């Protein structure tokens, strides 16, 4: 098995995937961006990726496509790596189930909703050249109600005593909401607040394999 | 099979399952919900799906689940139903394939991106209860980058004519942007600025299935209010 190649930087949505890679355990290589210098809409990444925001996979291992294929968004991206590196669902349930399904559901949300959302938040609060106050209230609020429909969704795995979103194991959607559940703080918003979010972030926190996720790329250099 | 019963609402994103269902040839039964009576917020509904947003769907078809498969997420919804009714691959490719990837790629950037941007903008635009110029333009600007994207992916798709996000077949990805492209004339953003879209939207809307899906549910005097 090649490394798989990560063009990152590290915010929640780069987070997502280095962390998700080190869970699969699968060898990976990083091209690190500098998101304050417009790096990702340089023209030879744009080729990779229209979009032209990080982070973008390029997977040598797959066959069927010449020099790898190239993937972006970290909803598709988490969903691919599932498919492909994680036959005996220890992170995952069997296609066509219900639980994969579902799985679908609150990945989709966090993409959809979550991370649109508290990254709104974040531009009025920390980038905008000017203060508004309407906006900051507008995405501040739905952060929060966003947190509150995952703290439900977890009180409704009774089963599993709200350790996973879905069933008896993290999955994809897990390890997405993970990546911005990591920088709430910076909202002055306590996840503790939904004491299920509370248990299951300090669950997730534990394990070797999203410690070194949240490593990749450094804040450095 | 038993009807897929849908609750919804005439909206972008009621529209893209509306179309793929009609698309796809199923039975299906509507239940519509007034957003400007905070419908989708009552206990029953959160019950189905706890973020109390439309559109959902139950598949009673769906035999592992007693009461059959209740699925949010437009996104969830559209991949859900391709996997399941489109088995012959008229609207999607074989799973595993580069090519079903490359669709997955682009609907989640049609369901993270577009969607939330363009509903941004529509929010500064006609349901604000103050002007905020800041976000008209935030939103208005990158709803335009968005779009800009799309026309560059379609330029990709050379060896197709550009006709098709992925391929040589509309696939959900397609049927995704469709809902929301539906709605850019209410903020008088011409989609024939961008030429290769502007082919393509007009060839979906010659298709009967999706003229069908866009009636569903009915456009009248009761939804046809912008404010
Ligand atoms: N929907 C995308 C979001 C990607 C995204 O927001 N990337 C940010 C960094 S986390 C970026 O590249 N920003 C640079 C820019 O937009 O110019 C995903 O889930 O991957
Ligand atoms: N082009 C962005 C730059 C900032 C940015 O890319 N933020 C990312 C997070 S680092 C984001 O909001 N992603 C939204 C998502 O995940 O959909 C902007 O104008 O706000
Ligand atoms: N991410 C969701 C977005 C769903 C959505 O925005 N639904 C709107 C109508 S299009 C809604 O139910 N609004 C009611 C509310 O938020 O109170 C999806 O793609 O399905
Ligand atoms: N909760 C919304 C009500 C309006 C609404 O639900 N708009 C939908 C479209 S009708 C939307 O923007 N959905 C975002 C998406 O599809 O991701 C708000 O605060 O403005």
Do not use: C, M
Request: hydrophobic share 35%; proline share 6%.
């Amino acid at each position: 098995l090649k490394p798989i190649k990560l063009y990152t930087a590290p915010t929640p949505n780069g987070y997502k995937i280095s962390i998700f890679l080190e869970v699969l355990g699968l060898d990976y290589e990083v091209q690190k961006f500098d998101l304050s210098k417009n790096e990702t809409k340089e023209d030879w990444f744009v080729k990779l990726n229209p979009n032209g925001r990080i982070p973008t996979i390029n997977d040598p291992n797959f066959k069927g496509v010449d020099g790898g294929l190239v993937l972006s968004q970290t909803g598709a991206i988490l969903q691919y790596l599932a498919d492909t590196y994680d036959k005996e669902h220890k992170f995952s349930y069997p296609a066509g189930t219900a639980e994969y399904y579902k799985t679908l559901e609150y990945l989709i949300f966090q993409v959809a909703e979550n991370g649109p959302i508290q990254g709104q938040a974040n531009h009025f609060v920390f980038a905008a050249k000017e203060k508004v106050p309407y906006g900051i209230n507008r995405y501040i609020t739905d952060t929060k109600r966003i947190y509150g429909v995952f703290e439900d969704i977890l009180s409704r795995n009774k089963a599993n005593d709200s350790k996973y979103l879905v069933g008896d194991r993290y999955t994809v959607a897990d390890f997405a909401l993970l990546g911005w559940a990591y920088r709430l703080s910076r909202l002055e918003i306590d996840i503790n607040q939904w004491p299920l979010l509370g248990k299951w972030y300090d669950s997730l926190l534990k394990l070797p394999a999203v410690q070194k996720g949240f490593e990749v790329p450094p804040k450095n250099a």
